[PDB]
Structure formats: C-alpha cells, structure tokens
Design a protein around this ligand. Structure first.
Ligand SMILES: *Cc1c(COP(=O)(O)O)cnc(C)c1O
Ligand SMILES: *Cc1c(COP(=O)(O)O)cnc(C)c1O
Lengths: 294, 294
C-alpha cells in the first residue's frame, strides 16, 4: 500500500456459510491466497529477507539461494524481484513446469536436482553454492524468521479479527512455521486457545503438507506448541477443496481443503467453538494438475 | 471479511519504485488482482447480481446466463457459487481450456459457440435461452450495474487512497465499465482529474482490451467521460508486463502491462503528476499462453 510489501499479510478472515456443522460452532478461514504471490509463503519469504537486511547480511544486488519443493520458491522469487535481489532456487525435478514458469516470471534462476536426490540433495547443493560464494542460503526449515513472521503478523491479526473469540487454530503443517509462530502468540494470551496441527494419513499425498517422522521434524518445530494432531485422508482434502469452490466460492489448493476438513471435525466435536483455519493458497496453480476434476 | 463478498474491492494502491520516469511524477497501481477470483471483473459481477437481488429479480437457486470471452466468466462463476446461483456461461470456442477449467471449478455450466459465431452469437444464444426460461441474462456490455460498481467503489477508493491528490486515471478499456464508473465519480470532485483510456493499436492483440469502432462502442460507454485515448502496441504491453514482474514483483496480465505502459507515457508527459493505473488481474492464468517467455 506504499509498496507491494505492505500488501503482504493483513489477509481476510471469512466465515463458512454453508459447509459448517449446525451445532453453534463457527469456522473462519484466513485467506493467505490474498498475499501478492498467492500463498502463505509470502510471509516467511518477506520475513527471512527483511530480517537478514536488518542484520546487515544482505543488500540489494546480492544473491539469495533456497531449496524448494513448492510455494516457497514462488514467494521468494517475488520478494527478490520486489526488493532487488538475485534469486537462485534449487528444486527436485518433479516440480511442475507451470510452477517453474511461475518462478521464472519473476526473474529467478532455477536449478534441478533429481527426484531421488530430493530436498536433502537440494539443500546440500545450496550449501555448496553458498561456500563457493554463489549466494546466501535462506533455509526455510531451519530459519527462525519463518515462524517469526507468524508470531508477529498472522497470530496477532487472527486475535484482532476474532476479537479474542478464537477457541481453536487449525493449520496444515509443512515447514511448521505457521503453526509454530501462531501458537507462540496464542500461548501468550490469557484465554486458552487449542492448537490443531494437520498431517496426511500414511499413504496420502497432499501438496504442501508433510507427515513428518518424529525423528525428522523441522528445526523450527516445537512439539509442545501443538495440542492435537489430526490426520487427513488425501481424498477428503481433495473433495473438501472441490466443495469449497462450488459451495462457498472459495477457490484454494489441496492443503486448504485439508485444513477445512480438519476444522470441520474440530467444529463438529466442540459446540459453540470459534475455529480458525489457514487457507494456504489460491487454486490457480492446481488446475493443470487435474485435481479440480471430480 | 464477514464473508467473501466483503473481500471484493478495497484493493491496494501501490507505487512503482523502479519503472517510473524521474521527473517528479508518481505512478500508482490499483491491484484488482487482489479480488477473490483474481480480476477486476469481480466488482461488476458482484454488482450485477447484488443489484438484481435488490430489485427482486433473482433469488438463490435461480439460473443466471452470461456471454463471456474472458475474466467475466470466472468472476461470475465465483459470485454464483458464493451467493447460491446456477451459472451458465456462453463463450466462443477459442476460450482456453485452462480458463474453462477455472470457470468449471466453481460449478458453472459452459456452452460453446464457434469462433465465427463469436460474442455476438454468444449473446444471441443467451437471449434465446432467456426466452425459453433457461435463465436470466446479465449482459455485461449493456448492464448499468457494471459501471455502477466502479462509481460506488473503485472511484471512491482511489480518491481516498490518494488523499484527493490523483491528477490522472488510466484504464485499459474492455467493457468500459471501469473507466466509465470511475470517470463519473471523478467528474463530481472539484479538482480536475484527467481520464485516460487505452486501446490496442490497429493489429495488436491484447487480452481484455478492445479497439472499439466508433459505431460499435458498448451500450454503457459515454465518450464525453474520457479526456484522451492512447494506443498501446501489443509488444509494448507484453514487454511492460514482463518488466513489472522482474523489476517490481508485480505479476499481472497483458492488459495490465498495457495500462502501465500508458501510465508511464502520461507520467513522462506531465511532471509532478499523480497517475493511477488499473492493474486488471494477476498473471497466473497467462503463464500457459507463453506470454511470460521473453
Ligand atoms: C507452506 C505451505 C503449507 C504449510 O505451511 P507451513 O507454515 O510451512 O507449515 C501448507 N500448504 C501449502 C500449499 C504451502 O505452501
Ligand atoms: C475487463 C478487463 C479489462 C477491461 O475492464 P472494463 O471495465 O471491462 O473496461 C481489462 N483487462 C482485463 C484482463 C479484463 O478482464
């Protein structure tokens, strides 16, 4: 609103009108697709770069590097274009060509590793580049500035937007930055707020959500910040995503369908609850995957 | 913000930081991609349906019909899903399959005419359906509720957001609803505001912009509301669109590149001007057309 940076965050909070249970509960959707590049990752991407600037680490013209398997690449390509950085993105070679085009449109340089090398191989290559002087690694799974975005913006906004009436917060977990930052903020309030994390069922594939083995949970994650973990079946996430568009006019991705599937279970269980769920992204980049077909 | 309806409009106004001329002028971008379905057409689509409701014409469950060649179909599919209507969209058979999928995701029914039948044939078929009792035609090129959206929302917002400092308003013209409604509002202010319409050069194809022959200007259009018309070359619109993404982090469609190309000429001509240009949509639905390639 001065510039594009000021359009990150302060996203709408809107109520489901047709899909909730009829038990007095309310389900409110935090529309992170309203961020300029269309997903929640704009918050972490902005924060990682702004805080690095504040620490004197980077200046416009410098090279930034990240390993990405999804929306973080798009968000970082956008912030780099916005703020005047050169962005290098390492990704496994099952990233869709459409998503590669989305990142390239902002001027980012993309680098492949094989699917079998994976995200681990992508991070290792990013470290090797950083050591050669080829750029600064952001490290979204380990960088505290990811959850800090949510501690300072997402959480406070949800509290204000609900007038402190929120009883439950529901987040599909990927990096865990969202749930971790929001929980940290909510824990500071006098009122108890139940923090609900979502993961896929074993064998379910839901873009953007991870079923972390206990031993390989991200560096930024703190199990004690989460009160309950619910599992989401892939088909339930996809069906709920399709239903959101047709019944509510809310056009979002698969993990957002998962978030609402989970929030509906929380709301059904707890009469008169005020449940807030993160809608992680708009549906646009999912159409070419076929997932909006019945 | 109660529901999704309240997320239509009140879009950001952000300044160009790198691409303006250095003559004291300012170029401000009104980000209509922030509307829930990603374009400026959400405003007209909402208004046509809300005003019909106010007139007692339609009630949830009723069938609405529109002939569309672009974003209006997506916007109306979304509003129909939001408000509980059954939407039927008639389009020429050069509509991209991706855009058909975008409309279908909201539950709309799509109907083809041939490219040679065109929009005229699409409107004629819509009238024939309306006469058989198969739905209510919205008629975006003739419906006053299209420009009324911009008279009551877009214009007032731009005035407030600039603190009355706007000197020029720049709009890529399609239906002409945006320029017509905003001009009507601006003309009511004591301060003069120059209204700049953009059309493609003869032989240029810019999605969403029309080069209307004088005799076939839309029903809603009033030539006296426009102070100057500038022509935009297709390549200039496309180059400026690509430049916006790379230099500003603003990822928008071809007509938005055209709007900024035009605004830059207005700003260059008029030192210390405060120029506001409409950014009509986000870039997402353009990636598959190849236009973001250099
Ligand atoms: C990042 C992302 C998530 C998870 O959010 P985190 O803060 O990383 O836990 C969920 N869905 C999508 C589509 C995402 O991009
Ligand atoms: C509708 C539209 C326009 C034109 O706006 P009008 O209010 O119809 O004149 C420009 N570009 C795109 C992409 C559009 O969808």
């Amino acid at each position: 609103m001065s510039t594009l940076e000021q359009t990150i965050g302060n996203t709408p909070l809107v109520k489901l009108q047709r899909m909730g249970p009829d038990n007095g509960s309310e389900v409110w959707l935090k529309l992170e697709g309203n961020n300029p590049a269309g997903s929640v990752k704009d918050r972490a991407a902005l924060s990682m770069i702004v805080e690095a600037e504040k620490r004197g680490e980077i200046k416009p013209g410098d090279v930034l590097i990240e390993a990405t398997s999804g929306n973080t690449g798009i968000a970082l390509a956008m912030i780099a274009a916005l703020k005047g950085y050169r962005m290098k993105l390492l990704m496994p070679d099952n990233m869709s060509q459409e998503r590669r085009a989305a990142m390239r449109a902002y001027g980012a340089e993309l680098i492949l590793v094989t699917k079998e090398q994976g995200m681990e191989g992508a991070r290792d290559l990013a470290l090797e580049m950083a050591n050669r002087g080829e750029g600064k690694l952001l490290d979204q799974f380990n960088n505290p500035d990811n959850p800090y975005a949510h501690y300072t913006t997402t959480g406070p906004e949800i509290w204000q937007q609900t007038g402190g009436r929120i009883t439950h917060f529901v987040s599909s977990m990927g990096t865990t930055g969202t749930i971790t930052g929001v929980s940290r903020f909510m824990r500071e309030q006098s009122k108890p707020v139940t923090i609900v994390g979502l993961q896929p069922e074993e064998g379910s594939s839901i873009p953007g959500i991870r079923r972390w083995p206990t031993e390989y949970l991200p560096g930024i994650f703190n199990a004690s910040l989460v009160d309950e973990v619910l599992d989401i079946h892939q088909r339930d996430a996809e069906n709920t995503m399709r239903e959101l568009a047709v019944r509510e006019g809310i056009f979002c991705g698969v993990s957002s369908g998962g978030a609402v599937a989970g929030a509906l279970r929380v709301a059904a269980a707890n009469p008169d609850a005020v449940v807030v769920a993160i809608i992680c992204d708009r549906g646009d980049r999912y159409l070419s995957t076929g997932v909006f077909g019945e």
